[PDB]
Amino acid sequence: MLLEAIFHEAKGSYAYPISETQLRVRLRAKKGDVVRCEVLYADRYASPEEELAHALAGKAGSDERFDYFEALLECSTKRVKYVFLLTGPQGEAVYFGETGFSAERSKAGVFQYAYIHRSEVFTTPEWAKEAVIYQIFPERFANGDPSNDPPGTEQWAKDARPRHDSFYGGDLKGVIDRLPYLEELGVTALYFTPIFASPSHHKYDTADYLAIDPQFGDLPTFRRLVDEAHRRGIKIILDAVFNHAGDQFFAFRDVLQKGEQSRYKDWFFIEDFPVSKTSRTNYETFAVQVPAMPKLRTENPEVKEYLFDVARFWMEQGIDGWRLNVANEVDHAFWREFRRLVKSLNPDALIVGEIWHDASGWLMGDQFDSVMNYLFRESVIRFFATGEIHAERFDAELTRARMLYPEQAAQGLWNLLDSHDTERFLTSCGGNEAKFRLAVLFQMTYLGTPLIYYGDEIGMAGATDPDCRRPMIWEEKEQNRGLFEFYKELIRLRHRLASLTRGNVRSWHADKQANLYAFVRTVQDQHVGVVLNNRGEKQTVLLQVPESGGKTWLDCLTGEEVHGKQGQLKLTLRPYQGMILWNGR
Numbered sequence: 408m409l410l411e412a413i414f415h416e417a418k419g420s421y422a423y424p425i426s427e428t429q430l431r432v433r434l435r436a437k438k439g440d441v442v443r444c445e446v447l448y449a450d451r452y453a454s455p456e457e458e459l460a461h462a463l464a465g466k467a468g469s470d471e472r473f474d475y476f477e478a479l480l481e482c483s484t485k486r487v488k489y490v491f492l493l494t495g496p497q498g499e500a501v502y503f504g505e506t507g508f509s510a511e512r513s514k515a516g517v518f519q520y521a522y523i524h525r526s527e528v529f530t531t532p533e534w535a536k537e538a539v540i541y542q543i544f545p546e547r548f549a550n551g552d553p554s555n556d557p558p559g560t561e562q563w564a565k566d567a568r569p570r571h572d573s574f575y576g577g578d579l580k581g582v583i584d585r586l587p588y589l590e591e592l593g594v595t596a597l598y599f600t601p602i603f604a605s606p607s608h609h610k611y612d613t614a615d616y617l618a619i620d621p622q623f624g625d626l627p628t629f630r631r632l633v634d635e636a637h638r639r640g641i642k643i644i645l646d647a648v649f650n651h652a653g654d655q656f657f658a659f660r661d662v663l664q665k666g667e668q669s670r671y672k673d674w675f676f677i678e679d680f681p682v683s684k685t686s687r688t689n690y691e692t693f694a695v696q697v698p699a700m701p702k703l704r705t706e707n708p709e710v711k712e713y714l715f716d717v718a719r720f721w722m723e724q725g726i727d728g729w730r731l732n733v734a735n736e737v738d739h740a741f742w743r744e745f746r747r748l749v750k751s752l753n754p755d756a757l758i759v760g761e762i763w764h765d766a767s768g769w770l771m772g773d774q775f776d777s778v779m780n781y782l783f784r785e786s787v788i789r790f791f792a793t794g795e796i797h798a799e800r801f802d803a804e805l806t807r808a809r810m811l812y813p814e815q816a817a818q819g820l821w822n823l824l825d826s827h828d829t830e831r832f833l834t835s836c837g838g839n840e841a842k843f844r845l846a847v848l849f850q851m852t853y854l855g856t857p858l859i860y861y862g863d864e865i866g867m868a869g870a871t872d873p874d875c876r877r878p879m880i881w882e883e884k885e886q887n888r889g890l891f892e893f894y895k896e897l898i899r900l901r902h903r904l905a906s907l908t909r910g911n912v913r914s915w916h917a918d919k920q921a922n923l924y925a926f927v928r929t930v931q932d933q934h935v936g937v938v939l940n941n942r943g944e945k946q947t948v949l950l951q952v953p954e955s956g957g958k959t960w961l962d963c964l965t966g967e968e969v970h971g972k973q974g975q976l977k978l979t980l981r982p983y984q985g986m987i988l989w990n991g992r
């Protein structure tokens with residue numbers, strides 16, 4: 408076996424507690440190199456004579472070139488040292504420890520997970536495991552209060568193609584009036600884009616962190632919204648913009664007027680005085696040159712004290728969590744203290760970070776509960792939309808990521824198909840709804856928290872920003888209700904099938920020629936297998952189905968068809984059809 412591909416480290420996503428007494432442990436190896444992987448472990452202070460415990464780690468998945476093995480060590484001492492025993496195809500075995508590789512269990516060395524602190528067991532709010540979030544862009548969602556409307560608001564119609572500087576008058580009142588809608592679709596929580604006072608369309612450049620923007624509403628209406636959504640079983644997640652403030656943020660105004668005599672000069676990153684927001688800048692902003700968003704010095708104890716208060720205030724109104732704008736650009740220090748705070752006020756308040764890339768460092772348990780899954784989005788784009796990759800690559804990309812973070816995180820990752828910063832998935836698919844549905848069908852059944860982008864459920868389309876911020880189509884006759892009901896059913900299934908929300912994922916079948924991929928979600932003895940035939944022609948397939956998880960399954964989308972004979976299941980699939988098999992337990 409190629410030792411150069413064997414991997415594990417006693418921390419991160421390869422060693423982590425799922426409770427105060429059990430250690431989840433993972434190991435990597437060249438695919439097909441190791442057939443059996445066992446872990447020999449014992450207390451860190453246990454005697455050399457004492458016998459070791461045994462833990463058999465089956466394959467939890469496999470990627471483009473590696474096999475991932477996963478074990479669960481019962482560490483009653485809450486301390487543990489351990490070694491790996493690896494065996495190959497033709498029977499060769501070898502030991503793996505911190506010291507290195509060896510045929511002797513001694514020279515292999517032993518890995519060490521010092522202690523397991525209860526305070527360090529990664530915990531996600533129970534409700535987040537089985538929620539289905541619906542992202543709302545207020546300014547472009549619903550106009551329920553016309554006098555809210557800001558100047559230059561444009562006609563609200565289907566054939567409306569937004570402008571970077573466009574306004575449509577949608578406000579919080581609009582969201583309250585549409586709650587009836589959301590309950591029907593079945594959303595569990597709403598994620599609102601920034602809604603505090605801001606002169607912009609997106610409101611990402613905050614004027615007042617403590618004020619609903621007038622065109623969006625007022626404190627009363629907000630309390631009103633929270634209350635009304637809650638009694639409807641819908642949670643509240645607001646956009647927390649702590650990386651940067653608006654050029655109108657009171658303290659920046661101070662800097663813009665009193666120069667160095669301002670007590671707030673130290674709340675931003677400024678090169679040369681006086682401040683010049685002309686076309687260039689003498690202060691650090693969001694992207695490159697973006698004047699309305701001077702970066703905020705979150706490292707400043709004072710700036711931090713302020714933003715937490717901003718958080719306290721709004722949290723006093725009953726909201727349920729935060730999506731953190733450009734979170735990866737604010738110090739972990741701030742965020743670690745942040746989790747400390749938020750959780751202190753509400754254990755179930757949800758913490759969501761916005762990192763469009765490997766956020767493994769924030770998903771260790773001390774900072775975030777999840778992040779919007781950048782990759783899920785990409786893997787789904789390449790497989791369903793563009794076709795840049797085949798079924799087997801899908802499984803690879805799909806699996807490789809899962810092994811990226813600790814189970815607690817992956818369980819809640821916000822798997823979106825799109826957001827306000829990208830093209831809409833329908834057009835992402837070249838308008839092919841067929842392909843589209845398969846992706847939402849999958850999105851709605853895979854490991855993580857589904858995030859519907861407002862309007863997607865009605866067949867709304869649009870290019871990337873700002874075309875993806877089109878006013879929600881509210882006229883039923885121009886709505887894709889055919890698709891709307893599709894969502895209700897998939898959404899419902901998620902709430903009815905425990906495995907789909909609290910289960911693990913193991914790949915079931917992957918055929919590159921068929922470009923057909925399937926997986927199985929499991930919780931206890933309940934097994935739900937999802938079959939995805941990504942081809943414009945229908946082909947039948949035979950999946951390996953060992954007669955122990957069942958020989959009878961029901962297509963929760965249509966109806967029964969248990970063809971398990973002599974260990975396998977022959978399935979004929981319609982084009983771009985997906986099947987969801989419930990093992991009946």
Ligand SMILES: OC[C@H]1O[C@H](O[C@H]2[C@H](O)[C@@H](O)[C@@H](O[C@H]3[C@H](O)[C@@H](O)[C@@H](O[C@H]4[C@H](O)[C@@H](O)[C@@H](O)O[C@@H]4CO)O[C@@H]3CO)O[C@@H]2CO)[C@H](O)[C@@H](O)[C@@H]1O
Binds near residue numbers: 761763
């Ligand atoms: O004029 C500036 C813009 O300000 C507002 O933009 C928001 C976005 O709507 C938010 O979603 C968010 O997005 C950032 C993101 O945080 C940041 O990492 C960056 O992302 C990269 C990413 O590293 C990478 O995956 C790659 O694919 O490209 C991305 C660039 O698109 O950029 C995102 C968006 O620029 O925060 C910003 C800033 O608050 C406003 O809504 C926009 O309309 C406006 O143009």
